[PDB]
Amino acid sequence: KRALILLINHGLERFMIGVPTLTIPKSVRQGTKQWEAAKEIVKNFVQKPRHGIILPDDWKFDTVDLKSAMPDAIPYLTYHDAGIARALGIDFNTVQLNMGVQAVNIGEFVSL
Amino acid sequence: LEGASVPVMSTSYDVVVDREFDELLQGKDGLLVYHKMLSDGTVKNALNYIFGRIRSAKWYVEPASTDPEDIAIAAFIHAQLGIDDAS
């Protein structure tokens, strides 16, 4: 459950804002004014997405196309939460975990 | 008759040896798997429910007849077991 929460926290940062990529020619190296300008463009795409992007005719700003939708991890979270509450030996009605599964009809001579 | 001339034979065959055919579950290595299955939520839940429902079965000693000797030895072994919780 903890590892899956960290996977969702790493996945939403990709599927909700999109990782930016930017291609420059080889003339620009690190520590230059153009390098700082490219840093400023990427930082403004992350932080202030309303100043827009203004590029020279050689630079190709793009988002990295993951080419797949984000898979629904909610059933896996409910599965491991069901595993915890099942290992504790308690029904899913007292602890609030009854989510779309049917209520108990009559039950047995006693409950769980 | 004289007696039982027929011995209690094994349940063994060429592959199945003593009610088991898997070599992983053959000897005491199967006890390791049976102990590691206690780390499951489903298995421990079912075992806790079944054993707790066994422990609240309302047991009672039933004697042999209505003779006071049978009632005496029944109450004797009832005190030996302690069906009432503590002793």
Show Cβ contacts of residue A77 under 8 Å, excluding neighbours closer than 6 positions.
A1, A4, A5
Q: Are A11 and A3 contacting, i.e. CB atoms less than 8 angstroms apart?
A: no
CA B61, distance to chain mean position in Å, is: 18
Amino acid at A108: E
Quoted resolution (Å):
3.7
Q: Whole-angstrom Cα distance, residue B1 to residue A5?
A: 74
Q: Are A103 and A93 contacting, i.e. CB atoms less than 8 angstroms apart?
A: yes
Contacts of A112 in chain B (CB under 8 A): 45, 49
The three-class DSSP label of residue A71 is coil
Question: Which phi-psi region, left, alpha or beta, contains residue A13 (left: φ > 0; alpha: ψ -120 to 50)?
Answer: alpha
Tell me which residue has tokens 């840093």.
A39
Q: Is A86 exposed, middle or buried (0-12, 13-18, 19+ CB in 10 A)?
A: buried
Q: Are B15 and B21 contacting, i.e. CB atoms less than 8 angstroms apart?
A: yes
Q: Could you tell me if A69 lies within 8 Å of chain B, comparing CB atoms?
A: no
Q: Are A58 and A102 contacting, i.e. CB atoms less than 8 angstroms apart?
A: no
- Size of chain A in residues: 112
Contacts of B42 in chain A (CB under 8 A): 86
- A58: nearest Cα among A22, A29, A20: A22
- B61: nearest Cα among B44, B78, B45: B78
Q: Could you tell me if B48 lies within 8 Å of chain A, comparing CB atoms?
A: yes
Contacts of A87 in chain B (CB under 8 A): 40-41, 44-45
Using the 8-state DSSP alphabet, how is residue B17 labeled?
A: B
Q: Whole-angstrom Cα distance, residue A38 to residue A61?
A: 10
Nearest Cα of chain A lies from the Cα of B56 at a distance, in angstroms, of: 11
Elucidated via: cryo-EM
Mark yes or no for CB contact B45/A84 under 8 Å: no
Q: Is A61 exposed, middle or buried (0-12, 13-18, 19+ CB in 10 A)?
A: middle
Q: In whole angstroms, how far apart are CA B73 and each of B56, B58, B76, B80, B86?
A: 24, 20, 5, 10, 20
Q: Whole-angstrom Cα distance, residue A85 to residue A111?
A: 15
Q: Are A28 and A34 contacting, i.e. CB atoms less than 8 angstroms apart?
A: yes
- A37: nearest Cα among A13, A56, A50, A19: A56
Mark yes or no for CB contact B48/A89 under 8 Å: yes
- A13: nearest Cα among A60, A46, A48: A46
- B75: nearest Cα among B56, B87, B60: B60
Residue of A86, A97, A109 to mutate, interface with B, max B Cβ within 10 Å: A86
Q: Are A61 and A41 contacting, i.e. CB atoms less than 8 angstroms apart?
A: yes
Show Cβ contacts of residue B18 under 8 Å, excluding neighbours closer than 6 positions.
B10, B11, B12
Q: Whole-angstrom Cα distance, residue A47 to residue B57?
A: 66
Show Cβ contacts of residue A60 under 8 Å, excluding neighbours closer than 6 positions.
A22, A23
Mark yes or no for CB contact A89/B53 under 8 Å: no
Question: Which phi-psi region, left, alpha or beta, contains residue A28 (left: φ > 0; alpha: ψ -120 to 50)?
Answer: beta
The H or E element that residue A39 is part of is helix A33-47
Residue of chain A whose alpha carbon sits nearest to that of B53: A110
